[PDB]
From Swiss-Prot, chains A, B:
ATP binds at R19, S20, G21, K22, S23, T24, R183. DGMP binds at D18, F75, R79, R100, Y108, S109, Y154. Disulfide bonds: none annotated. Pathway: Pyrimidine metabolism; dTTP biosynthesis. It comes from Plasmodium falciparum (isolate 3D7). This is Thymidylate kinase. Inhibited by deoxyguanosine (dG), deoxythymidine (dT) and azidothymidine (AZT).
Amino acid sequence: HMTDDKKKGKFIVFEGLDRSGKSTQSKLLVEYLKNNNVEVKHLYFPNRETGIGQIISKYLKMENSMSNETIHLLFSANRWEHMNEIKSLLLKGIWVVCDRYAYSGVAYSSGALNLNKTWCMNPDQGLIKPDVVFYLNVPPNYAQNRSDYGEEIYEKVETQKKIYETYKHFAHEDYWINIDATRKIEDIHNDIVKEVTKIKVEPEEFNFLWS
Amino acid sequence: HMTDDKKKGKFIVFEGLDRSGKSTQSKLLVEYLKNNNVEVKHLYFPNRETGIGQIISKYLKMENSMSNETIHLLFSANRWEHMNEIKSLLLKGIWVVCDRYAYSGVAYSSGALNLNKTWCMNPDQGLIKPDVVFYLNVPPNYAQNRSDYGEEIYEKVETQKKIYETYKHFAHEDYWINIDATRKIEDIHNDIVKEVTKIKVEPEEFNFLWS
Ligand SMILES: Nc1ncnc2c1ncn2[C@@H]1O[C@H](COP(=O)(O)OP(=O)(O)O)[C@@H](O)[C@H]1O
Ligand SMILES: Nc1ncnc2c1ncn2[C@@H]1O[C@H](COP(=O)(O)OP(=O)(O)O)[C@@H](O)[C@H]1O
Ligand SMILES: Cc1cn([C@H]2C[C@H](O)[C@@H](COP(=O)(O)O)O2)c(=O)[nH]c1=O
Ligand SMILES: Cc1cn([C@H]2C[C@H](O)[C@@H](COP(=O)(O)O)O2)c(=O)[nH]c1=O
Ligand code: NA
Ligand code: NA
Ligand code: NA
Ligand code: NA
Ligand code: NA
Ligand code: NA
């Protein structure tokens, strides 16, 4: 009752290759939720505004160079420093719609940096687990013509090919919903809405990666 | 031969409670090695001068506050960004004498922050393993009168008591050498020298935590 510590909002993550449409789709979903009287906050990773995120942003823009393990652990620490906020929102009944999470961490590091997958998962163990992940599936060559593509470190077609394969580490999980993202914006969004309307709305216990 | 990738220097770590004499002893050992014609570099963790180390230094000085997991992972990332340097030194035949390493990470986080020990070890898995660790053993109340004690976050006797117990996670390992550090500087140093002279001097393969 008073000490109720149940998760009341839902936590939805978008995952996908670079420029696959995650910001596009997460903003449309947020607007749809607001229109159906659901309180919701839009979050994303990496958050480049924190001290850790600033270092990350320099890495992505090739303004610095860092060893594979060092940058992998910063991407994870950047999520941890948001756990208090995500937990509080969800306890309040506010939904969280989030562009990228720990699945990006594992897929990008194991595919682009060739880090060991179990080693990559470890530091994200214990993060709050989302209700669903929409994976905006595009082939590795598909998005190379969209606006700023090639500006940041992983945006080369040969790297995207590797990350496309390591995203399959999650492809058969029950929380993972493959979405064909080589379609019109509105078609993709309608599929996402269809899936979101099946989410069961009741307060429940928090769960944690990698359960 | 030409592609020889053998570890040629030795890697010695000092561990110990706050103000237990690690900088004192590591400088004396460095001077002793130089006097016996051994090339050596003195390193220490956290390195507060990097981008990551700056954030760490603010945490230790209570200039910011951070969640337990976030700061734990930064302490680990701070070691990783030194692996290229430590590896190169050791390949060259330069010894590395280092004030604190991954054992501090595990002992401080599991003792002061109550983090799960296996979770704390994971991100340091894969770091280069030292030849020996001297643990400058002092009781948890012992150092409270030494110069700047109480300036930084963990320097309260009740926290030191907890970290004293979690340093025992390594107490029975073959690389771990307990040194009674409640003695005169010169007596402690003579014990360390005695142990250092038993190290076998030949080139060998690198080993890695937590083997
Ligand atoms: N399905 C789509 N069809 C055409 N253009 C799209 C589609 N989805 C997104 N875009 C455009 O592609 C670019 C990248 O989209 P964005 O949502 O920013 O990708 P991400 O967040 O995955 O990097 C933007 O210019 C966006 O307007
Ligand atoms: N064995 C000792 N006896 C008396 N004073 C010592 C001894 N070892 C170190 N000190 C003094 O204690 C303080 C902390 O020593 P330091 O080597 O800086 O500790 P740490 O590096 O472990 O924090 C310094 O003022 C140092 O001169
Ligand atoms: C969240 C996360 C993102 N990334 C990559 C995915 C993108 O290439 C870049 C983030 O940029 P974005 O989401 O604008 O594309 O960071 C990681 O490598 N590890 C992570 O943990
Ligand atoms: C290297 C390391 C140090 N620490 C603590 C030990 C000290 O209290 C502080 C470092 O300060 P120092 O070595 O001057 O004392 O950081 C950690 O908590 N985790 C680590 O991984
Ligand atoms: Na990108
Ligand atoms: Na985005
Ligand atoms: Na699925
Ligand atoms: Na200290
Ligand atoms: Na020191
Ligand atoms: Na021993």
